[PDB]
Structure 1
Amino acid sequence: EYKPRLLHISGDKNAKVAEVPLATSSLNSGDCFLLDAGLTIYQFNGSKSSPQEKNKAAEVARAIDAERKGLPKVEVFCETDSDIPAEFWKLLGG
């Protein structure tokens, strides 16, 4: 099947970000997250925490931005409510 990627951007006051395997349930709503799917990519940023993961994340998305040359499509949002749109959760969870 396609090659999905689960990146995580968060760490309460001790922010930390790094690669991660699939995880729809073990996800982390509230901090900024990034899933990579073939050409599309959803930075499911989480509003319960904006500055830590927004910095560490914007850092990660920037590097991926220069690596793929923007060829792929991205979707970024650090939201909490409605944080589970069947489309993204169907992608990595379904």
Structure 2
Amino acid sequence: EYKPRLLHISGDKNAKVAEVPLATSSLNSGDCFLLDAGLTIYQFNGSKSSPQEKNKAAEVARAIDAERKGLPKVEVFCETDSDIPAEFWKLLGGKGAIAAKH
């Protein structure tokens, strides 16, 4: 399905993924998120996220890609990156300040 959804990867060393409301306000600097927009999957790594969380997010993205027979494009970026795509923020309802924690 190409209806955008936001997945939240948390747990620090014990990474878990779960859908959360699709909004910028659902994000936080300590975790990882996958904004699944259908043809494009955006992976946002919180600046304080853990290696296990990054790996989990990547694993979920590959699984989604596999189910979709490789059609989606996957973009990965760190929270502090200077070239995060504008579409990521647009789909989240607009760029804004991220909570330090969930």
TM-score (norm. length: structure 1): 0.76
- Contact 2:40/2:73 (<8 A) preserved: yes
Count of residues in correspondence between the two structures = 94
Gap change, CA 1:80 and 1:7, over 3 Å in 2: same
Change in Cα spacing, 1:71 to 1:35, as seen in structure 2 (3 Å) is same
Matched-pair contact (CA < 8 Å) for 1:8–1:19: yes
Q: CA deviation at 1:26?
A: 2.3
Q: Which stretches in structure 2 are left out of the alignment for 5+ residues?
A: 95-102
Give the aligned CA root-mean-square deviation in angstroms.
Answer: 2.7
Would you tell me which structure has more strand in proportion to its own residues? Answer: 1
Gaps of 5+ in 1: none
- CA deviation map 1:39-84 (0-9, x unaligned): 1121112231131211221221121121112201111123335597
Q: Which residue of 1 aligns with 2:60?
A: 60
Instruction: Give how far 1:8 is off.
Output: 1.1
3-state SS of 2:22 partner: coil
Give the equivalent residue in structure 2 for 1:71: 71
User: In the aligned structure 2, how far is the partner of 1:56 from the partner of 1:45?
Assistant: 11
Are the equivalent residues in 1 in contact too, given 2:29–2:46 (CA < 8 A)? Answer: yes
Q: Which has the higher mean CA deviation after the structures are superposed, 8-17 or 51-60? A: 8-17
Identity, in percent, stands at 100
8 Å Cα contact 2:32-2:43 kept in structure 1:
yes
Alignment TM-score, normalising by the size of structure 2: 0.71
